[PDB]
């Protein structure tokens, strides 16, 4: 599709009317600061036109809710402990220039540590196992 | 009024009318037959007809029905009218920014006259554009 | 919207005078004489 960069076929133009549902789609199932990556499931027209999730995602209320609670207790940590803490300039990107990244990405350095609070044993024991996880765990069983 | 103008059939009848009035000025009213605004231009312009006469004359388009004129104004295709002189489409500057055709309904009858008779001045003139007597700024 | 852009190629005191044209139309269908 970038290759071709204008064909202006029929099928393509139907597909793009379902833009903003996409993208509200795709806001939707964001990862959260406990989870790597969102291995996500999609829908795409042949193209490589309207690329959108179509997974929904839904979560165990409460094991929701212990999840946050997790991850605002590290956020606390961190805020705790560095002094000079980094603003992530906006907007992050050069504006003029069109920084993409696909093959980087892939053959990307290991998703280094996400949010997540370390877990004693004998206080919260039988969550650690299956807690930060992407669906999250507690899924199979 | 639908008995008092004459209505037209298709785009070359139209293109035709357009042409063929050599020393009056021509208002088509291109709309859909059963809107409200449409309908209240046309009982507007039925009463400015007969007025009008030795100087301008009205017409009608079906807009659904003949199609051929969607280069006149985008598809944008509201319930307009628009001006014609010697087969020179005749601009006339109001407030609302669309110069080309008045895509808006005027109530006063004198005041439609007026604005017709400006454009026919200018036309008279060789003029393109008219400011119109009247403002609007109302009625986009 | 966006369906619209696509497709740009395809698709109070009135009232009174409303009354008077719907009844002329009807009055013109009874009668579709010579």
Redesign the interface.
């Given at each position: 599709h970038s290759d071709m960069a204008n064909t202006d076929k029929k099928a393509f133009?139907?597909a793009?009317?379902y833009?903003?549902h996409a993208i509200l789609k795709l806001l939707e199932n964001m990862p959260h600061p406990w989870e790597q990556a969102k291995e996500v499931k999609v829908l795409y027209h042949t193209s490589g036109a309207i690329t959108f999730v179509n997974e929904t995602p839904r979560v165990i209320e409460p094991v929701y809710t212990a999840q946050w609670s997790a991850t605002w207790i590290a956020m606390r940590r961190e805020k705790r402990d560095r002094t000079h803490f980094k603003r992530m300039r906006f907007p992050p990107f050069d504006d003029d220039e069109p920084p993409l990244s696909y093959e980087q990405h892939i053959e990307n350095i290991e998703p280094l540590d996400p949010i997540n609070l370390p877990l004693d044993s004998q206080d919260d024991e039988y969550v650690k196992d299956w807690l930060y996880d992407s669906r999250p765990l507690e899924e199979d069983s | 009024a639908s008995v008092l103008l004459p209505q037209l059939r298709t785009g070359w009848h139209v293109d035709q009318a357009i042409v063929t009035e050599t020393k009056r000025l021509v208002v088509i009213r291109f709309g859909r037959k059963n809107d409200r605004q449409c309908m209240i231009m046309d009982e507007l312009l039925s009463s400015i007809a007969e007025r009008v006469r030795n100087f301008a004359v009205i017409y009608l388009c079906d807009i659904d029905e003949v199609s051929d004129f969607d280069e006149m104004y985008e598809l944008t295709d509201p319930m307009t009218v628009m001006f014609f002189y010697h087969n020179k489409h005749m601009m006339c500057d109001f407030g609302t920014g669309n110069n080309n055709k008045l895509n808006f309904i005027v109530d006063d009858k004198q005041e439609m006259i007026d604005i017709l008779e400006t454009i026919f001045r200018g036309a008279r003139k060789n003029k393109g554009l008219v400011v119109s007597p009247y403002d609007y700024n109302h009625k986009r | 919207y966006?369906?619209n852009l696509?497709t740009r190629q395809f698709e109070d005191a009135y009232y009174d005078l409303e009354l008077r044209n719907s009844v002329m139309d009807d009055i013109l269908e009874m009668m579709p004489e010579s």
């Open positions: 133009l139907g793009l009317k833009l903003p | - | 966006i369906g696509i």
